[PDB]
Design an enzyme around this catalytic site. Sequence first.
Site, PDB file in Angstrom:
ATOM      1  N   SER A 259      -0.516  15.604 -12.050  1.00 54.87           N
ATOM      2  CA  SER A 259      -0.767  15.248 -13.435  1.00 54.87           C
ATOM      3  C   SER A 259      -1.005  16.514 -14.257  1.00 54.87           C
ATOM      4  O   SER A 259      -1.527  17.516 -13.767  1.00 54.87           O
ATOM      5  CB  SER A 259      -1.968  14.300 -13.518  1.00 54.87           C
TER       6      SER A 259
ATOM      7  N   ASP B  96       0.832  -1.200   0.000  1.00 55.07           N
ATOM      8  CA  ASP B  96       0.000   0.000   0.000  1.00 55.07           C
ATOM      9  C   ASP B  96       0.872   1.258   0.000  1.00 55.07           C
ATOM     10  O   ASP B  96       1.363   1.680   1.053  1.00 55.07           O
ATOM     11  CB  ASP B  96      -0.910   0.000   1.216  1.00 55.07           C
TER      12      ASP B  96
END
EC number: 3.4.23.22
Length: 330
Positions: free
Chosen positions: A199, A35
């Site tokens: 992004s 994770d």
Amino acid sequence: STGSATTTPIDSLDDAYITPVQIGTPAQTLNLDFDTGSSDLWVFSSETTASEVDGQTIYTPSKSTTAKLLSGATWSISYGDGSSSSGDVYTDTVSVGGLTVTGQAVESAKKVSSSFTEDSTIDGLLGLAFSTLNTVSPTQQKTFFDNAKASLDSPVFTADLGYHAPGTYNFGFIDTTAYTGSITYTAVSTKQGFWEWTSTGYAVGSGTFKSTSIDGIADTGTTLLYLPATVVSAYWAQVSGAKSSSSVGGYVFPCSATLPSFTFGVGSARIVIPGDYIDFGPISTGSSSCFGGIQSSAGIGINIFGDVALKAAFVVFNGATTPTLGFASK
């Protein structure tokens, strides 16, 4: 040193991925959920409340000659899905894919919430975010990667998650045969303890690319792709019959649909998520309403590049002095 381990979807939807991990002496092998959005290595154990164990493999520290109680140390964690676990702490030897760390903090669960009990395939979590998020008190502990880093050939790990197929986590090296083209690296902020990056935009299907900054986290422990409501609305508007359902808890779409792809930007590069990766199947057994793999982050407080996004790429988690993330197509 290096390590290399296969990671396998837990079910036919790729809801999560499990990777075998050796703990203790002699080894006890548990299948852990790696994770990159948390920083605790915790396991079902011989200390877990018996009624909360249902098929998981447990770690028994009393059977490990290298286990040592970390005196006074406790841990307690809550995840974005509302699940939680807590317990005490041992140090022990932990190996992943041939890479061994001695003295790793292994957090032994005394209590786990219902969603963990109900998932017999996940024996615990292995956190790979920054150690500043580790919950052990009163002395915070380091992640497996942080402990291994100095010994690794290169201070990196890579995530190569499969679509309906096994994939690989590598530590200490970049397998240049595992991706196509080049790797595009992008800046990371560690201020929130996550692999947080920006992004450069998105496209829906064959549509034009929209240049817009989207700050979010690379999170292998989250199934879906959570993005701003504007972006998610633009995606689902291209799917006939798709709608946001308050009763279901997100966007749903007709199971008869063919979904468009979704592209996200990494600098000047582009990662394409095929439409099929966005199908999470019937909302309930036999339903013709299917659950979407792109959902709004509006109620979270952060955008999350979870498995739906990451499995479309070869992803480098670069733990150099200034960390960065790398993405390549594959």
